[PDB]
């Protein structure tokens, strides 16, 4: 908990992180997106994911191939917020940062995406 | 900051022989072409075993090659030894065999040839079987080395049986306290 913040993403935050920041893992290498063939060539024979909005679907509405839809991604190497942080070593509910922000993870992803 | 890249991040295989023999590296030139362009794991075993040392390519007998060749439904295959093929004088009748080896021994050459079958090199094999069809891929027993019996010694356990390093043989040479229950203990 004290090394982490989390919360509950919008649909807009699912899209903007996969559109702008979404990279993907191709035989242990990190491959950007740039087209639908990077998603389709690895998740269409087994799973049924060919588009980007496929990958946005079974992550947002947590579908039966969520295990693959989110381990396909690389970890989202986010920027730093604009305006920065609040304290980083108090809880969100104390005076702000770590732990569950819970709907205010959206406002913070606008700064980082 | 990120985590955390000790080992064996750098893998410790071989990617080349350690060997300045030109006839051996011409076979590496074939078999990188053969492995890359026919993706058979036959040709990747031949390539990876062509890199190896003198240990890890142990010899193989003329009697162990005649006796792996009682593989059923295989009357016409080739014996592939990335290694040497030694003569066995405990084998009284050599069968009719097709042998591909790096070194076939000289007296193993005549007993294969007077039978008579084939000694081939690994480029007479690349033409006959570019994908390793009709092949018996055989190696020698690695840990038949004497050096392997000395790995490794620390008495207390009834597994041990692991061969101490000792200059001569006989009593007076490491046979009393720890070997013998009337001298200290048995190990």
């Amino acid at each position: 908990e004290p090394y982490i913040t989390w919360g509950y993403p919008n649909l807009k935050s699912v899209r903007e992180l996969i559109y702008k920041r979404g990279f993907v893992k191709h035989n242990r290498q990190r491959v950007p997106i740039t087209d639908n063939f990077v998603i389709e060539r690895k998740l269409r024979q087994a799973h049924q994911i060919q588009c980007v909005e496929d990958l946005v679907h079974e992550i947002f509405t947590v579908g039966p191939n969520f295990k693959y839809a989110s381990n396909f991604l690389w970890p989202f190497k986010l920027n730093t917020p604009t305006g920065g942080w609040r304290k980083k070593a108090n809880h969100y509910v104390n005076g702000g940062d770590f732990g569950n922000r819970e709907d205010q993870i959206n406002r913070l992803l606008r700064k980082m995406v | 900051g990120i985590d955390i890249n000790h080992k064996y991040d750098r893998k410790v295989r071989r990617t080349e022989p350690k060997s300045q023999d030109v006839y051996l590296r011409l076979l590496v030139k074939l078999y990188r072409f053969l492995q890359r362009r026919t993706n058979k794991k036959f040709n990747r075993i031949i390539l990876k075993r062509l890199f190896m040392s003198k240990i890890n390519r142990p010899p193989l007998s003329l009697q162990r090659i005649a006796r792996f060749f009682k593989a059923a439904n295989q009357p016409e295959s080739t014996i592939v030894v990335v290694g040497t093929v030694t003569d066995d004088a405990r084998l009284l009748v050599v069968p009719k065999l097709t042998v591909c080896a790096l070194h076939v021994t000289q007296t193993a050459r005549e007993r294969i040839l007077k039978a008579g079958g084939e000694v081939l090199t690994f480029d007479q094999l690349a033409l006959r079987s570019p994908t390793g069809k009709n092949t018996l891929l055989l190696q020698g027993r690695r840990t038949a080395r004497t050096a392997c019996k000395h790995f490794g010694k620390a008495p207390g356990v009834p597994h041990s049986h692991t061969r101490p390093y000792v200059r001569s043989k006989g009593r007076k040479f490491e046979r009393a306290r720890g070997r013998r229950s009337s001298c200290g203990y048995k190990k």
Partner: protein, 147 residues
């Protein structure tokens, strides 16, 4: 330690190389027990071997296009990378921009009821043309009920 010295034989020094070193069938006469060393490669021409139609008929393909293929474009300030990754972005991006162009006309009409000048081309081409292209959808209710 280097091979290739220019060597001149005589003929009775060339007759004796089959006695000193052996032959490829028999052993030597003068080096008792010596056989000639066997190579690891008999054919040894990698140029003939790589042609070679025993080898060449089993190989895969050189499949040839090389994939340099890098830059990640941003599909939130691009549109030609957003309409490539997600078609149906185009559909609603048009469907809202066409409705946004229709909200404009209802505003500049309802404002200009205090001026109501034209009806021609200058500040009312993007207004009064589409205000009278609702006669072009008078047809769609009238002439399309013949089916």
């Amino acid at each position: 330690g280097h091979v290739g010295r220019f060597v001149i034989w005589t003929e009775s020094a060339f007759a004796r190389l089959n006695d000193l070193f052996g032959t490829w069938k028999k052993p030597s006469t003068l080096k008792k027990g010596y056989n000639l060393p066997q190579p690891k490669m008999a054919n040894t021409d990698l140029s003939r071997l790589l042609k070679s139609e025993e080898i060449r008929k089993v190989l895969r393909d050189p499949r040839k296009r090389v994939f340099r293929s890098v830059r990640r474009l941003n599909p939130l300030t691009n549109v030609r990378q957003l309409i490539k990754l997600n078609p149906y972005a185009e559909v609603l991006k048009r469907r809202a921009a066409l409705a946004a162009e229709k909200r404009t006309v209802a505003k500049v009409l309802a404002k200009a009821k205090k001026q109501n000048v034209e009806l021609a081309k200058s500040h009312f081409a993007n207004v009064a043309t589409k205000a009278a292209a609702n006669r072009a959808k008078l047809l769609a209710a009238r002439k399309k009920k013949v089916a």
